[PDB]
Specification:
This is part of a larger assembly, with chains A, B, C, D and E. By secondary structure, chain A is an alpha/beta fold. Chain A has helices at residues 25-43, 69-74, 87-97, 121-134, 151-158, 181-185; strands spanning 4-10, 48-53, 62-65, 106-113, 137-142. By secondary structure, chain B is α+β, with helices and mostly antiparallel strands. In chain B, the strands form two sheets. Chain B has a four-stranded mixed β-sheet. In chain B, strands 3-4 form a two-stranded antiparallel ribbon. In chain B, strand 5 (86-92), helix 3 and strand 6 (116-119) form a beta-alpha-beta unit. By secondary structure, chain D is mainly alpha-helical. Chain D has one domain. In chain D, helix 7 (108-117) packs antiparallel against helix 8 and helix 7 (108-117) packs parallel to helix 9. Chain D has 16 helices and no strands. At the B-C interface, loops of B face loops of C.
């Protein structure tokens, strides 16, 4: 019933082409896209969801549309062959969120990290204080093989919303047999 | 290998107005739009065009937006009112081209393979 | 129950019966999407097929200048016309059959002709042989 | 299957820290840090005598593969088929590895060069031209690999040891010089490239020197110490003087493949002095 | 294929728990994401060419 615009941010790097996460990590992260799009549609039939990729390019393959079946057609041939790029992936995620055709919706980004990040901590904390001035809740969800709980991601969660902020949760995964049940326990309803 | 392009004199004109539409708030100093055309021979022809919502930031100079969804449906309308017309490329203004133009061109070559961009000069006319 | 060789073996049957069940409807539904694309192809050909404003059939009477000619409709009056741009105007010899625009009324393309079986009294060929023995005694 | 590498643990130096690390990474069922490290440990400088002790497991990797980059799969099987050192079955082995990765992945193009690299060794005329010609038919629609330009222009570099290849090799040894760019391989290979590049451009018919590749640093920055006479004589063609001293001092030094065409060298300078004195 | 059936006879979990694993991974995907994408192609094309 609440009005927002959720922007999912998948990874199609090479590092999702391995099999600790059961069948395929693409098959893991696609089911994660399956449950977040059906969550944001059934909790509110008025919002809209678009996807953005981050590896090797930043493609806006679906624009921020209310129908989810376009996204699910584009999750096929996702071609996991890229190399992770992080610093432009959120600035290209935020300028999409300044293209909101309905300017009463809130601004929300979720992102899937299945590759190690290689970026300065000073760049992201400038992006963190940028999003503080820009009022965006980004929910970072960790997948894949992981430099587990970096200080850069953890402080970016803290410097996203400090001094009694929202609490945009840093979702951590145990690498092993799991569904998106840890993804839906706390953060998909209380973020 | 394209021989040459032919400027129908409605398209330029229809870049001047859309630069004047946003020109009350114009500080981006660039307007990207889609160049409709008629592929005839090795020589090329241009008949019509339209615009697209476009943003760009010099900070990190690779953050920008071509609305694929707006490019699908509005071109689908111009296809419906005129089956002769199709896409041949795109355009922008602000006579110094910018570093992003590799990214726009290599994106929308998946609409027409031998796509072509045309820079107009709205303010220089001398 | 643990694993006493049958809770093993009963599982492999019920897992593989479920996979071939769910792979079956996938092939059937993908086949149905392949079929409608053939139907959508015919619809978009029809949307392309909606601008044949016609062409006027006439014949060249004589050549006036390099780009002026004298044509006449099959039941109508005479006209003075021109070609498009690159029609190779040397082939427009007077007597040929051309096609005209409806409104601009200029020449689009010349066409070959066969009509009027009085032509079949004087102009056709007969390259048929007999092998010199079907007739006899001369 | 883990004990397959427990018995072939040896001869890879620092055996416990790397081979027990190896049997960690595929028991995590990951396929990139696994893949990048086995490519590193074949690149590990030894004799690599355990190619047979790894080509069974690299075939085992290839059987339940279903995720791994076929580029790096062929990039590691070329080291395997190198260390086989037996060209009888190595042709049919590489055809088998080429036909079992038969998708649209563009490592098949450098399978064909690896076919030809062992085919410009034996049977050097009848179908070597075809396995050359098929690659630039396929060198299309994605010029951004540049390893497709690497392996094929190396295949035509081995085609230089035919009779009628002087200018086309010189045209193509520049193409390899322009596709891959940075130093990234020793001067002890680079100055030998520029030495045979200057000889190919000198014995070529239509080319004389075609300067400002003289300005390109892969010949002058690498042999400004030894064989300066080749840089000196290519300046003398660009100078347009006859200058009988240094244009014979190249023939004093370079005895093979230069005294057999010294009259053509005198033929070239006499037609080259005109087009600079009229300039 | 005697070893293909026969290794499912003397192994109790390797030939079964993985088959439990690779089905429940498939059935939560190859059922779910595949036929729902195909569902969101057919409803569009009927809202098309009609």
């Amino acid at each position: 019933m609440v009005l927002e615009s959720t922007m999912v941010c998948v990874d199609n790097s090479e590092y999702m082409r391995n099999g600790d996460f059961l069948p395929t990590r693409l098959q893991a992260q696609q089911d994660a896209v399956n449950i977040v799009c059906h969550s944001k549609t059934r909790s509110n039939p008025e919002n809209n969801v678009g996807l953005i990729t981050l590896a090797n390019d930043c493609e806006v393959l679906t624009t921020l549309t209310p129908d989810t079946g376009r996204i699910l057609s584009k999750l096929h041939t996702v071609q996991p062959k890229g190399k992770i790029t992080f610093c432009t992936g959120i600035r290209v995620a935020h300028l999409a969120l300044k293209h909101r055709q309905g300017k009463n919706h809130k601004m929300r980004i979720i992102a899937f990290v299945g590759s190690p990040v290689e970026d300065n901590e000073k760049d992201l904390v400038k992006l963190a204080k940028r999003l503080k001035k820009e009022k965006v809740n980004v929910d970072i969800i960790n997948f894949g093989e992981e430099e587990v709980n970096t200080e850069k991601l953890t402080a970016f969660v803290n410097t996203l919303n400090g001094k009694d902020g929202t609490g945009s949760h840093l979702v951590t995964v145990p690498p092993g047999p799991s569904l998106a049940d840890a993804l839906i326990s706390s953060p998909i309803l209380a973020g | 290998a394209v021989q040459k392009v032919v400027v129908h004199p409605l398209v330029l004109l229809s870049v001047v107005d859309h630069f004047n539409r946003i020109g009350k708030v114009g500080n981006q100093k660039r307007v990207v739009g889609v160049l409709l055309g008629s592929w005839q021979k090795k020589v090329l022809d241009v008949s019509n065009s339209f615009a697209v919502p476009f943003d760009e930031d010099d900070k990190d100079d690779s953050v920008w937006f071509l609305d694929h969804d707006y490019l699908e449906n509005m071109y689908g309308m111009f296809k419906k009112v005129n089956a002769r017309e199709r896409i041949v490329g795109w355009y922008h203004t602000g006579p110094k081209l910018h570093k992003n133009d590799i990214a726009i061109n290599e994106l929308m070559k998946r609409y027409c393979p031998n796509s072509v961009l045309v820079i107009i000069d709205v303010k220089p006319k001398d | 129950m643990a694993d006493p060789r049958d809770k093993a073996l009963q599982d492999y049957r019920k897992k593989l019966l479920e996979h071939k069940e769910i792979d079956g409807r996938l092939k059937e539904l993908r086949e149905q999407l392949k079929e409608l694309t053939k139907q959508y192809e015919k619809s978009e050909n029809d949307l392309k097929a909606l601008q044949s404003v016609g062409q006027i059939v006439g014949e060249v009477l004589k050549q006036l200048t390099e780009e002026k000619f004298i044509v006449k409709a099959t039941n109508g009056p005479r006209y003075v016309v021109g070609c498009r741009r690159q029609l190779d105007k040397s082939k427009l010899k007077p007597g040929t059959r051309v096609a005209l625009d409806m409104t601009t009324l200029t020449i689009m393309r010349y066409l070959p002709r066969e009509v009027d079986p009085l032509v079949y009294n004087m102009s056709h060929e007969d390259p048929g042989n007999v092998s010199y023995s079907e007739i006899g005694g001369l | 299957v883990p004990g397959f590498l427990q018995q072939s643990q040896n001869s890879g130096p620092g055996q416990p820290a790397v081979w027990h690390r190896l049997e960690e990474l595929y028991t995590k069922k990951l396929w990139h840090q696994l893949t990048l490290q086995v490519l590193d440990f074949v690149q590990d400088p030894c004799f690599a005598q355990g190619d047979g002790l790894i080509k069974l497991y690299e075939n085992f990797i290839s059987e339940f593969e279903h995720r791994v980059n076929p580029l790096s799969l062929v990039e590691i099987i070329l080291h395997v088929v190198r260390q086989m050192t037996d060209p009888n079955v190595a042709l049919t082995f590489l055809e088998k590895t080429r036909e079992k990765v038969k998708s649209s992945d563009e490592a098949v193009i450098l399978c064909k060069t690896a076919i030809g690299a062992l085919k410009l060794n034996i049977g050097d005329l009848q179908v070597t031209k075809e396995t050359i010609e098929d690659v630039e038919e396929m060198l299309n629609n994605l010029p951004g690999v540049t390893s497709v330009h690497s392996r094929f222009y190396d295949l035509s570099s081995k085609y230089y040891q035919t009779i009628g290849n002087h200018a086309s090799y010189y045209k193509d040894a520049l193409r390899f010089l322009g596709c891959v760019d940075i130093k990234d391989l020793p001067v002890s290979e680079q100055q030998e490239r520029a030495f045979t590049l200057g000889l190919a451009g000198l014995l070529g018919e239509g080319v004389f020197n075609f300067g400002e590749l003289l300005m390109h640093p892969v010949l002058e920055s690498l042999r400004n110490t030894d064989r300066q006479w080749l840089i000196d004589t290519l300046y003398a063609f660009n100078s347009g003087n006859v200058e009988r001293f240094q244009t014979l001092k190249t023939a004093w030094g370079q005895q093979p493949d230069l005294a057999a065409n010294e009259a053509q060298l005198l033929r070239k300078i006499q037609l080259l002095c005109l087009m600079e004195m009229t300039f | 294929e005697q070893d293909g059936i026969g290794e499912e006879v003397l192994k109790m979990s390797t030939e079964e728990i993985i088959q439990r694993t690779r089905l429940l991974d498939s059935e939560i995907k190859i059922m779910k994401s595949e036929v729902l994408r195909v569902t969101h192609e057919l409803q569009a094309m009927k809202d098309k060419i009609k």
